[PDB]
């Protein structure tokens, strides 16, 4: 076409990474042109219908790759980077977007380089990456298996290896969306992922950074299959901070969220070792830990579980008042 010609021209124009070393006026002029070009195409692909044709796909993916797939410093050109993120996001979210054509260019190497950007120290960038990968996962069925494995590899390298990662939280938030949409009978690889990966994540000392997201994944797993709650709770009690620390509040938060979605038949399977730990928390030297544990009695659903099993639980919580 003719509009298609100009669109492709502007996309390729944003593939030129220039830098005027000693001419501030020309540098600002150049950076503005690219900023304007990106802004134009963002508005264009967003509000105009039937503008994404087949020749556009290899151009957009290339422009994204050239601009984003870089090396992270241990940014400053974020205004341009955010535009690229927003444009590529409008590209995927468009009603005219056809995965059948795009899967030729959005391949495993693209997904791999996209995942390597999750190690960015910029929270804004990881947020754009979280949204993008979530969209790619849902729109590309043939990539879902590869994505899960690579995310799995990053976690294993974060836990048992030594590689520090800055996007563990953002990655866990993506998984939460995936877990919530699992098939009726959970596959074995999913159960393995819960037991061999998600649970040992509680061991890492930097748990505080990604704990809310980790807890959500664990809970969503139990809402799918309540059978998995016994190895989950027992492992949670294993990884429980032996050294009385304010980090106990996180475990207490996660534990109550688990109890809010637990089955009665599953409750009696782990109620004794749980409330023995809970009893220790009420007797804690740290007030914050005791305050959090005592708040369990306010949970009306837990009370019903306790009342149904008061003969076994009450002697644990109040030894000088009750016996077996």
């Amino acid at each position: 076409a003719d509009q298609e010609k100009l669109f492709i021209q502007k996309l390729r124009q944003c593939c030129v990474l220039f830098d005027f070393v000693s001419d501030p006026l020309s540098d600002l002029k150049w950076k503005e042109v690219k900023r304007a070009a990106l802004s134009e195409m963002v508005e264009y692909i967003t509000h105009n219908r039937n503008v994404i044709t087949e020749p556009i796909y290899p151009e957009v993916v290339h422009m994204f790759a050239v601009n984003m797939f870089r090396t992270l410093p241990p940014e400053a050109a974020w205004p341009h980077l955010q535009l690229v993120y927003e444009f590529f996001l409008r590209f995927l979210e468009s009603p005219d977007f056809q995965p059948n054509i795009a899967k030729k260019y959005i391949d495993q190497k693209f997904v791999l380089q996209l995942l390597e950007l999750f190690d960015s120290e910029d929270p804004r960038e990881r947020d754009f990456l979280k949204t993008t990968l979530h969209r790619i996962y849902g729109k590309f069925l043939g990539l879902r298996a590869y994505i899960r494995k690579q995310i799995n590899n990053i976690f294993y390298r974060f836990i048992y290896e030594t590689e520090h990662h800055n996007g563990i939280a953002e990655l866990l938030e993506i998984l939460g969306s995936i877990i919530n949409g699992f098939a009726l009978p959970l596959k074995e690889e999913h159960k393995i992922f819960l037991l061999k990966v998600l649970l040992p994540l509680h061991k890492v000392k930097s748990l505080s950074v990604y704990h809310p997201q980790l807890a959500y994944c664990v809970v969503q797993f139990l809402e799918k299959d309540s059978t998995l709650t016994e190895p989950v709770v027992m492992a949670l009690l294993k990884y429980w901070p032996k050294t009385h620390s304010p980090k106990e509040v996180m475990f207490l938060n996660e534990l109550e969220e688990i109890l809010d979605v637990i089955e009665p038949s599953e409750f009696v399977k782990i109620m004794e070792p749980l409330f023995r730990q809970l009893a220790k928390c009420v007797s804690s030297p740290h007030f914050q830990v005791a305050e959090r544990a005592l708040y369990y009695w306010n949970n009306e659903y837990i009370m019903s579980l306790i009342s149904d099993n008061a003969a076994k639980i009450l002697p644990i919580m109040f030894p000088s008042l009750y016996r077996n």
């Binding site: 879902r144 969306s177 995936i178 919530n180 949409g181 098939a183």
Partner: peptide
């Protein structure tokens, strides 16, 4: 808000 759930499909 959270990310919209992704329904699992045969792979």
């Amino acid at each position: 808000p959270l990310l919209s759930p992704i329904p699992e499909l045969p792979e």
